[PDB]
Amino acid sequence: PISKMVTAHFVLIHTICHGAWIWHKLKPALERAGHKVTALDMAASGIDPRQIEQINSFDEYSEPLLTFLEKLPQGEKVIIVGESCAGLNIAIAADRYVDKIAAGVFHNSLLPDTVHSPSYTVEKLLESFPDWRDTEYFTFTNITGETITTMKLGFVLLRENLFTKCTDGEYELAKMVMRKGSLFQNVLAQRPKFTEKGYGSIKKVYIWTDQDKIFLPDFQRWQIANYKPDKVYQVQGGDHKLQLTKTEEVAHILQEVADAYA
Amino acid sequence: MVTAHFVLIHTICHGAWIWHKLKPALERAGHKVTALDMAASGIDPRQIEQINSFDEYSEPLLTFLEKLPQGEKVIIVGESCAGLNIAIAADRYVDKIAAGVFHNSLLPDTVHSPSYTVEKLLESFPDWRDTEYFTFTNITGETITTMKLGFVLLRENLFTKCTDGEYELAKMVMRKGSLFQNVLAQRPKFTEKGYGSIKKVYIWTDQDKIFLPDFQRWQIANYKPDKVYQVQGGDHKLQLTKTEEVAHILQEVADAYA
Amino acid sequence: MVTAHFVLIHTICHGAWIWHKLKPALERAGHKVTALDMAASGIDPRQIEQINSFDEYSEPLLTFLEKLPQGEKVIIVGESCAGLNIAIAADRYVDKIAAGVFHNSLLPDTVHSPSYTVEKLLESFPDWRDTEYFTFTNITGETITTMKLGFVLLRENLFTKCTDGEYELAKMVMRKGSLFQNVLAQRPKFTEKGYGSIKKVYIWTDQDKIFLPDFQRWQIANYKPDKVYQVQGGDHKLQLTKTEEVAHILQEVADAYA
Amino acid sequence: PISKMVTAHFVLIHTICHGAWIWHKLKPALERAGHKVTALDMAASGIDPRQIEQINSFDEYSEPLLTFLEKLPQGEKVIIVGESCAGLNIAIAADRYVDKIAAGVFHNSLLPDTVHSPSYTVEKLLESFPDWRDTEYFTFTNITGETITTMKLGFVLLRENLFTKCTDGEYELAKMVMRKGSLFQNVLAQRPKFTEKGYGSIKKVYIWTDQDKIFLPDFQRWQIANYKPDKVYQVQGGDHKLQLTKTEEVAHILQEVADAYA
């Protein structure tokens, strides 16, 4: 009747242990469409020089996102795309920069709410997938005495549960650049709940596949029921790393989100 | 067909990740593959300012080799500047090395100082375009120049023919690096008994836009390798643009030097 | 008499060595003593330019405490700037600490930022005479100022009344150091539950020529300790000039906080 | 008849594992007499920032001495005092800077000769004292493939054999600043012999005590017989670290060496 097509600025946010590198296929695909794309390493992730033992909360871990959003020009707005654990990075950012966020896109991601503790969807994830196979765990004591659990993701878990259907080159890449990570779950438990005015007001799009072998269909569906997304897009096939196994589909879905939220 | 253990060594500023396509290809043929990050490269936690020479930068290779079980031998494959890591390593562990393979790489010799081919390379390719440079003073007082490779140079000279996903990955994980050229200029020449006795295979393409044809031809003539394999096409990153080809040459090296 | 385990913490630029007279004295009374080098201090192999904050500098203390066997408690004694290491450490391990002792030391509080007493000290003693200063940028972009303490300052202000052998040792092993003051200015204040709950004993002398009487009196009034012991005479390095006296006070602290 | 008194520039050289710090009592004592004193840390010793694994020979280890002697003004000459292993540092230096050396003083030290391999007195030391008690050993591979043995001196050996009669403060100091060390003995074995024109021409004074519990009377006496010192001064009592247990005696002996050799 009147049709609309929009170009947007997407800020792509990796999950813990990973870095900006997992977006290396989706970032050129989005740029083919003319969108602007920023892919950031969070503290102690990718090639960020900080070590995880110097980081004391998931909020401190999120510093690169918040700094980048503090830096945005007046009137610029971004669509934050976060995979796996990064729905927590979107919730943290949205409670500081709601103004700057056109929409949050959850990509096989944790979907925080405002009603329960920030750690709530993490506890639910762990009830759903409690065995992290060959993952190793470590701890350190943070700046106020909390003991923080970190992990080095196991290679079998990487091969079968996160990168199930990815290329051998993509799986070898992962092994070559994967870092330690932490959920800081116990400090999240002590955290103020996400606000309604910030995070609670953001548009929220949930992309997911039922073939995800680590954020399982029962968990994903529980999250959607628990906090209704403004839109849900289920991708057929692929695996947890849909930005690698369904790069073009994900880019076409993200075009639709730009058209709807700019 | 012999299966071999290959130790793949990236160049300065890069990391084990550039071998992400070559490591599975080699493993499809039954080979064992170890891809190492050098100091302050890839995801190694050290920053470049705490490394004081190119031998300290080679530490992950030397520690690996130091620990190789007695009687095992490896084929070290090095790209670009990593021919200098092969020579450092061959001088210390000649008996653990079945052959050195140079992939569009510096090919040091025994007759001139360790920085000779770096001088030659820079003479050949003097403008590193948008690359930025920085300096720090190392622990004995020398000024070390570091660089942050420029994205136009990355796109047109290094990753000329690489996929967009590959070029984009490169920008996502590239680190600062240093040739430590002036410390190489003061370094003892590579020995004849160590580096000089190693079998040497040189892989290149005349389509490389940064180690140019006449510089690579100069190198071959300056220190003739046991075997030279020339790949047609590709770009400087043959392990990305000609992956199966390099894997096939590396199979011939395994067959020949077991 | 209770015997206690004392963890002695030197100040920036120094190392475990300043406690070389105090550690045997304490051990003559049956106490266990651990004297640690902080990052890039004494003979620690790290250089100051790779340390990025005062909490990273405190790493040898925190690792020690992290490993203390369950149920053991220590008395941490800190000189000069090391009151900041006690506060960092008390925030992370309050239950492992029987008491903090401040030996002519900064006494941080919970109400103002972590750099408050450093600002105050510098206001009090602004000219560090022949000290030289240097800067580097840490891994997140902050400019960190380092110093090399000047030998006249070492002789007249720090080691005022020390033996010539002691002053000479000091020159032989002194290292660069940093307050990381601007990073302390950005740091979360010390907590009431951790540092704020620790027992605190302040040892000083009014003959100290660098932490001057009115600055030390200001500190006591700003954050009143559980006990203040004033030693007559000596100089800033009471563990060298009043060794048996400090050992005797430290015995009273062991008796009191077991 | 005519009496002479001379002020000299002494360069004090520590043994492996130790640093310039062991001279902290003798350096003020010599300066009381008006002499000029330089005490240098050798590579990877004291607070020198290099690590022993980056050092490849006893000659490279000696760099701080040779650099300092390269730096001396025309016509200045020094008396090099070396304790324990540092007679090897004096021999290396004398083959580069004979011109700059008024005398070499061996202080319970190895006394190299020109007739045998540079490693010869080390082999003889080890036959004499083969058990280094609680010392730990390690190896690394040097720049041309030689395996180098390093050691961390044991605390009992330190207490009873090197610092036998020293103060508890002096013994605690030692433990607080002691570093790894190496003799590089196998690379010394491969080294050209010290020359007659350089080291062979230097004046040589041997200070020693028969109470030394690590360079034992039979070893010391064998060395004196093997290569006659221009003068020998035996100190009664003390221990291996005569610059700590006999600081003033050693300083008066060193005055006599200044008077005789300037």
Short mmCIF file of C-alpha atoms in Angstrom, two decimals, chain A:
data_model
loop_
_atom_site.label_atom_id
_atom_site.label_comp_id
_atom_site.label_asym_id
_atom_site.label_seq_id
_atom_site.Cartn_x
_atom_site.Cartn_y
_atom_site.Cartn_z
CA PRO A 1 0.00 0.00 0.00
CA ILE A 2 2.99 1.96 1.28
CA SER A 3 5.91 -0.35 1.72
CA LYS A 4 8.98 0.71 3.83
CA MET A 5 12.64 -0.44 3.83
CA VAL A 6 15.09 0.92 6.47
CA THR A 7 18.95 0.84 6.97
CA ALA A 8 19.97 0.58 10.59
CA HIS A 9 23.04 0.46 12.88
CA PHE A 10 23.31 -2.98 14.46
CA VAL A 11 25.61 -3.50 17.45
CA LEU A 12 26.42 -7.23 17.60
CA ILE A 13 27.21 -8.62 21.07
CA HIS A 14 28.85 -12.08 21.53
CA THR A 15 28.28 -14.44 24.48
CA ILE A 16 30.77 -15.16 27.31
CA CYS A 17 33.97 -16.97 26.30
CA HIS A 18 33.49 -15.85 22.67
CA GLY A 19 34.34 -12.49 21.00
CA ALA A 20 33.34 -10.19 18.14
CA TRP A 21 34.86 -12.83 15.79
CA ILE A 22 31.61 -15.06 15.87
CA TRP A 23 29.95 -12.27 13.89
CA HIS A 24 32.48 -12.46 11.12
CA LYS A 25 29.98 -13.93 8.62
CA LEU A 26 26.85 -11.96 9.66
CA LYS A 27 28.71 -8.57 9.69
CA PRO A 28 29.58 -8.60 5.90
CA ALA A 29 26.07 -9.98 5.11
CA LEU A 30 24.43 -7.08 6.95
CA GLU A 31 26.78 -4.62 5.29
CA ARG A 32 25.82 -6.03 1.90
CA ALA A 33 22.37 -4.76 2.69
CA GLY A 34 23.82 -1.30 3.42
CA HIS A 35 23.44 -1.49 7.22
CA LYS A 36 26.10 -0.11 9.56
CA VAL A 37 27.48 -2.85 11.89
CA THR A 38 29.59 -2.54 15.06
CA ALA A 39 30.84 -5.84 16.64
CA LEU A 40 32.35 -5.35 20.06
CA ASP A 41 34.53 -7.55 22.30
CA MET A 42 33.30 -7.41 25.93
CA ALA A 43 35.87 -7.26 28.77
CA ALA A 44 38.22 -10.29 28.82
CA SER A 45 36.67 -11.70 25.58
CA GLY A 46 38.06 -12.07 22.01
CA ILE A 47 41.32 -10.10 21.97
CA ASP A 48 40.36 -7.72 24.77
CA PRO A 49 43.58 -7.37 26.89
CA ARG A 50 41.83 -7.73 30.27
CA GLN A 51 41.84 -11.02 32.06
CA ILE A 52 38.63 -12.41 33.51
CA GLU A 53 40.06 -12.44 37.02
CA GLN A 54 40.29 -8.61 36.96
CA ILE A 55 36.48 -8.34 36.18
CA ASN A 56 34.00 -8.28 39.02
CA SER A 57 30.49 -8.32 37.69
CA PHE A 58 28.53 -8.92 34.47
CA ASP A 59 28.00 -5.12 34.45
CA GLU A 60 31.80 -4.52 34.46
CA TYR A 61 32.06 -7.22 31.79
CA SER A 62 29.56 -5.16 29.73
CA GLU A 63 31.73 -1.96 29.83
CA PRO A 64 32.61 -1.99 26.06
CA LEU A 65 28.88 -1.85 25.16
CA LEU A 66 27.99 0.93 27.57
CA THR A 67 31.08 3.03 26.57
CA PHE A 68 30.15 2.62 22.89
CA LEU A 69 26.52 3.68 23.65
CA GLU A 70 27.75 6.64 25.73
CA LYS A 71 29.72 7.62 22.62
CA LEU A 72 26.75 7.60 20.16
CA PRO A 73 25.80 10.95 18.54
CA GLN A 74 22.59 12.67 19.63
CA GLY A 75 19.66 11.15 17.94
CA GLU A 76 21.43 7.95 16.76
CA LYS A 77 19.76 4.71 17.75
CA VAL A 78 21.00 1.14 17.41
CA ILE A 79 19.59 -2.34 17.27
CA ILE A 80 21.60 -4.46 19.78
CA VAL A 81 21.75 -8.10 18.66
CA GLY A 82 22.98 -10.43 21.45
CA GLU A 83 23.57 -14.21 21.18
CA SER A 84 23.27 -16.76 24.01
CA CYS A 85 24.17 -14.97 27.32
CA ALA A 86 24.13 -11.53 25.74
CA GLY A 87 20.39 -10.82 26.48
CA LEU A 88 21.87 -9.83 29.92
CA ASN A 89 24.20 -7.33 28.12
CA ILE A 90 21.09 -5.90 26.34
CA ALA A 91 19.16 -5.58 29.66
CA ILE A 92 22.13 -3.80 31.38
CA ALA A 93 22.59 -1.44 28.43
CA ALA A 94 18.86 -0.69 28.11
CA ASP A 95 18.70 0.40 31.78
CA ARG A 96 21.40 2.98 31.01
CA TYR A 97 20.62 3.96 27.38
CA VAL A 98 16.96 3.20 26.54
CA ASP A 99 16.95 6.36 24.45
CA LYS A 100 19.61 4.93 22.15
CA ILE A 101 18.08 1.57 21.55
CA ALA A 102 15.63 1.05 18.68
CA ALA A 103 15.14 -2.70 19.59
CA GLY A 104 16.93 -5.58 21.36
CA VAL A 105 17.20 -8.81 19.31
CA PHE A 106 17.69 -12.04 21.31
CA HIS A 107 19.45 -14.60 19.12
CA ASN A 108 19.14 -18.07 20.85
CA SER A 109 19.54 -15.88 23.87
CA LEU A 110 18.77 -15.54 27.50
CA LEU A 111 15.64 -13.24 27.74
CA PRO A 112 15.80 -11.42 31.15
CA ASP A 113 12.66 -9.96 32.64
CA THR A 114 12.02 -7.19 35.17
CA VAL A 115 9.86 -9.25 37.49
CA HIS A 116 12.51 -11.68 38.76
CA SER A 117 16.20 -11.38 39.76
CA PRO A 118 18.68 -10.69 36.88
CA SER A 119 19.97 -14.27 37.52
CA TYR A 120 16.60 -15.92 37.03
CA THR A 121 16.93 -17.03 33.39
CA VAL A 122 20.48 -18.30 34.13
CA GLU A 123 19.12 -20.57 36.95
CA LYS A 124 16.44 -21.77 34.55
CA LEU A 125 19.03 -22.43 31.81
CA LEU A 126 21.06 -24.53 34.21
CA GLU A 127 18.08 -26.59 35.28
CA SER A 128 17.45 -27.27 31.59
CA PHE A 129 21.10 -28.05 30.60
CA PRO A 130 23.02 -28.93 33.77
CA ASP A 131 25.83 -30.91 32.27
CA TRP A 132 28.49 -28.94 30.42
CA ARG A 133 30.29 -32.05 29.49
CA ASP A 134 34.01 -31.49 29.29
CA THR A 135 33.88 -27.82 30.47
CA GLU A 136 36.34 -26.99 33.23
CA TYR A 137 35.58 -24.61 36.02
CA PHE A 138 37.81 -22.30 38.08
CA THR A 139 37.21 -19.62 40.68
CA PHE A 140 38.73 -16.40 41.83
CA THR A 141 37.73 -13.95 44.58
CA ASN A 142 36.45 -10.61 43.34
CA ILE A 143 36.94 -7.07 44.71
CA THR A 144 34.37 -7.38 47.59
CA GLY A 145 35.10 -11.03 48.39
CA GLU A 146 32.54 -12.88 46.17
CA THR A 147 33.82 -16.09 44.66
CA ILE A 148 33.36 -16.10 40.96
CA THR A 149 33.17 -19.17 38.91
CA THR A 150 34.76 -19.11 35.46
CA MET A 151 34.90 -21.84 32.82
CA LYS A 152 36.92 -22.96 29.82
CA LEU A 153 34.30 -24.52 27.52
CA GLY A 154 35.07 -28.09 26.58
CA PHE A 155 35.83 -28.99 23.00
CA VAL A 156 33.19 -31.76 22.78
CA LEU A 157 30.55 -29.39 24.15
CA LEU A 158 31.79 -26.84 21.56
CA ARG A 159 31.63 -29.41 18.71
CA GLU A 160 28.27 -31.05 19.56
CA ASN A 161 26.30 -28.54 21.58
CA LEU A 162 27.28 -25.02 20.47
CA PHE A 163 28.76 -25.54 16.98
CA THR A 164 26.77 -28.71 16.12
CA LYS A 165 26.23 -28.01 12.43
CA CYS A 166 29.02 -25.50 11.77
CA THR A 167 31.89 -25.95 9.28
CA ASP A 168 35.11 -27.61 10.48
CA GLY A 169 36.87 -24.32 9.69
CA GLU A 170 34.37 -22.52 11.90
CA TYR A 171 34.73 -25.09 14.65
CA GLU A 172 38.59 -24.96 14.44
CA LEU A 173 38.41 -21.15 14.48
CA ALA A 174 36.40 -21.32 17.73
CA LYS A 175 38.98 -23.53 19.42
CA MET A 176 41.72 -21.14 18.28
CA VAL A 177 40.20 -17.99 19.91
CA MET A 178 37.91 -19.09 22.76
CA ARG A 179 38.59 -17.47 26.13
CA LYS A 180 37.47 -18.16 29.71
CA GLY A 181 34.07 -16.78 30.66
CA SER A 182 31.73 -16.20 33.61
CA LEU A 183 28.08 -15.67 34.18
CA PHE A 184 28.89 -13.89 37.54
CA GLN A 185 25.62 -15.60 38.52
CA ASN A 186 25.88 -15.05 42.22
CA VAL A 187 26.60 -11.33 41.82
CA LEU A 188 23.65 -11.22 39.32
CA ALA A 189 21.48 -12.74 42.08
CA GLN A 190 22.41 -9.83 44.36
CA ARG A 191 21.66 -7.29 41.53
CA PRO A 192 18.68 -4.90 41.34
CA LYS A 193 16.12 -6.09 38.91
CA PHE A 194 16.06 -4.69 35.38
CA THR A 195 13.75 -1.67 35.23
CA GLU A 196 10.50 -1.28 33.48
CA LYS A 197 11.27 2.20 32.23
CA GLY A 198 14.53 1.15 30.66
CA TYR A 199 14.79 -2.45 29.62
CA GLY A 200 11.09 -3.12 30.17
CA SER A 201 10.24 -0.56 27.48
CA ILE A 202 12.59 -1.80 24.67
CA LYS A 203 11.18 -3.60 21.63
CA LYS A 204 12.27 -7.22 21.80
CA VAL A 205 12.57 -9.74 18.95
CA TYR A 206 13.41 -13.39 19.74
CA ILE A 207 15.16 -15.45 17.01
CA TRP A 208 15.72 -19.14 17.84
CA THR A 209 15.85 -22.67 16.27
CA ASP A 210 14.48 -25.85 17.82
CA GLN A 211 17.73 -27.60 16.69
CA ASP A 212 19.75 -25.72 19.25
CA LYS A 213 21.59 -28.37 21.21
CA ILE A 214 22.42 -26.18 24.23
CA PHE A 215 19.54 -23.64 24.70
CA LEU A 216 17.00 -26.46 24.29
CA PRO A 217 13.37 -26.11 22.92
CA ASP A 218 11.87 -26.48 26.41
CA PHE A 219 14.09 -23.70 27.80
CA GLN A 220 13.53 -21.36 24.83
CA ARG A 221 9.80 -21.87 24.88
CA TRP A 222 9.72 -21.37 28.63
CA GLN A 223 11.50 -18.02 28.14
CA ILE A 224 9.04 -16.83 25.45
CA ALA A 225 6.10 -17.77 27.74
CA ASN A 226 7.79 -16.16 30.69
CA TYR A 227 8.26 -12.73 28.98
CA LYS A 228 6.45 -12.23 25.70
CA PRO A 229 8.76 -10.90 22.95
CA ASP A 230 7.26 -8.28 20.66
CA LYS A 231 7.98 -10.76 17.78
CA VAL A 232 9.41 -14.29 17.59
CA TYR A 233 11.13 -15.73 14.47
CA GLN A 234 11.91 -19.43 14.58
CA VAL A 235 14.56 -20.56 12.06
CA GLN A 236 14.36 -24.07 10.78
CA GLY A 237 17.52 -26.08 11.04
CA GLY A 238 20.88 -24.68 11.86
CA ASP A 239 22.30 -24.93 15.40
CA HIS A 240 23.05 -22.61 18.32
CA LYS A 241 25.33 -20.47 16.16
CA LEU A 242 22.71 -19.38 13.70
CA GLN A 243 24.92 -16.44 12.66
CA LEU A 244 27.23 -19.05 11.21
CA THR A 245 24.83 -21.82 10.09
CA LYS A 246 21.95 -19.49 8.91
CA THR A 247 23.84 -16.25 8.21
CA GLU A 248 21.63 -15.04 5.36
CA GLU A 249 18.27 -15.99 7.00
CA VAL A 250 19.35 -14.19 10.16
CA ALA A 251 20.36 -11.16 8.06
CA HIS A 252 16.91 -11.14 6.35
CA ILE A 253 15.16 -11.36 9.69
CA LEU A 254 17.32 -8.49 10.92
CA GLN A 255 16.23 -6.41 7.90
CA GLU A 256 12.62 -6.90 8.99
CA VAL A 257 13.50 -5.72 12.49
CA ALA A 258 15.16 -2.55 10.94
CA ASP A 259 12.01 -1.96 8.88
CA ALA A 260 9.81 -2.22 11.93
CA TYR A 261 11.94 -0.39 14.59
CA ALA A 262 14.56 1.49 12.53
#
